[PDB]
Design an enzyme around this catalytic site. Structure first.
Site, PDB file in Angstrom:
ATOM      1  N   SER A  96       0.748  -1.220   0.163  1.00  0.00           N
ATOM      2  CA  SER A  96      -0.154   0.033  -0.216  1.00  0.00           C
ATOM      3  C   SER A  96       1.012   1.156   0.063  1.00  0.00           C
ATOM      4  CB  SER A  96      -0.886   0.058   1.226  1.00  0.00           C
ATOM      5  OG  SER A  96      -1.670   1.454   1.324  1.00  0.00           O
ATOM      6  N   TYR A 120      -2.970   0.281   9.826  1.00  0.00           N
ATOM      7  CA  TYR A 120      -3.004  -0.395   8.656  1.00  0.00           C
ATOM      8  C   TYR A 120      -1.602  -0.255   7.660  1.00  0.00           C
ATOM      9  CZ  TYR A 120      -4.252  -0.889   3.887  1.00  0.00           C
ATOM     10  OH  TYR A 120      -4.346  -1.334   2.294  1.00  0.00           O
TER      11      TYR A 120
END
Ligand SMILES: NC(=O)c1ccc[n+]([C@@H]2O[C@H](COP(=O)([O-])OP(=O)(O)OC[C@H]3O[C@@H](n4cnc5c(N)ncnc54)[C@H](O)[C@@H]3O)[C@@H](O)[C@H]2O)c1
Length: 238
Positions: A131, A144
């Site tokens: 990500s 995250y």
């Protein structure tokens, strides 16, 4: 890009980027298997396996069963993942634990069950979806982002452990993908030190899958331990 007759495994194949990637491999001629918590569609253009990548016992059992009958595993794509947002001091104990169990533990369990196979066959390609939040701090996504930084570091070390065996191990790090809030992402949020997107659009899952296909292919035969950020330039190269 051509993947005829190659065995390809994709986790998170149920929807989003995992589905788009499993589909792209099918359209490139491969024999694909998608793994996911749930396959709630009525049909899938590949074979499907129920699997909670965080359950180490279920991963062992499924991988053992499937490796009994495949000569060779040409490509593994780790794309399973969840997003739990919150300020660091308000994140619930549960959101912290499953963020890591799924986003890092998932790949770790797949690696623990497949590395012997990659060693035995002496080649193949791995691709792990991280990500942009592993490259830059994100208000609201500390957990995250950190779980995807752990994933990235895990996959690169695995890639170094398997390089002797001729295995290439790489990552793709998507920015905002489609899975008026979209035009505000594109402009950016200066107040939260989150740049807009210079290419003036958000990503399509196919544009993430296409990058995964390149990296899994023989066109990338000298590319290993790399991480391609696919995000319209939003991180400015970082
Ligand atoms: N959408 C974005 O903008 C974006 C940005 C950065 C990274 N990503 C990453 O891309 C990948 C795919 O995300 P998406 O946007 O397609 O998400 P999504 O939620 O649309 O789909 C992800 C899939 O992962 C599966 N999954 C979740 N937990 C699982 C588990 N324990 N075991 C097995 N499968 C499990 C889900 O069932 C779902 O089918 C993820 O790794 C995600 O973190 C996405």
């Amino acid at each position: 890009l051509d993947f005829h007759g190659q065995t390809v495994w994709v986790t998170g194949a149920g929807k989003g980027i995992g589905y788009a990637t499993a589909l792209a491999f099918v359209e490139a001629g491969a024999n694909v298997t998608g793994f996911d918590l749930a396959f709630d569609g009525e049909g899938y253009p590949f074979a499907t396996e129920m699997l909670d990548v965080a359950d180490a016992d279920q991963v062992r059992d499924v991988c053992a069963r499937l490796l009994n009958d495949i000569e060779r595993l040409d490509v593994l794509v780790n794309a399973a993942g969840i997003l739990r947002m919150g300020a660091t001091d308000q994140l619930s104990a549960e959101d912290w634990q499953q963020t890591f169990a799924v986003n890092v533990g998932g790949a770790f369990n797949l690696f623990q069950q497949t590395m012997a196979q990659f060693r035995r066959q002496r080649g193949g390609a791995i691709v792990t979806v991280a990500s942009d939040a592993a490259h830059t701090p994100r208000i609201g996504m500390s957990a995250y982002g950190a779980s995807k930084a752990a994933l990235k570091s895990l996959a690169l070390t695995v890639g170094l452990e398997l390089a002797g065996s001729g295995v290439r191990c790489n990552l793709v790090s998507p920015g905002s993908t489609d899975t008026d809030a979209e035009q505000q992402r594109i402009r950016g949020f200066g107040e939260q030190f989150k740049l807009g997107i210079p290419l003036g659009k958000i990503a399509r899952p196919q544009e993430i899958a296409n990058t995964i296909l390149f990296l899994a292919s023989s066109h990338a035969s000298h590319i290993t331990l790399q991480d391609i950020v696919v995000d319209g330039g939003s991180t400015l190269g970082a």
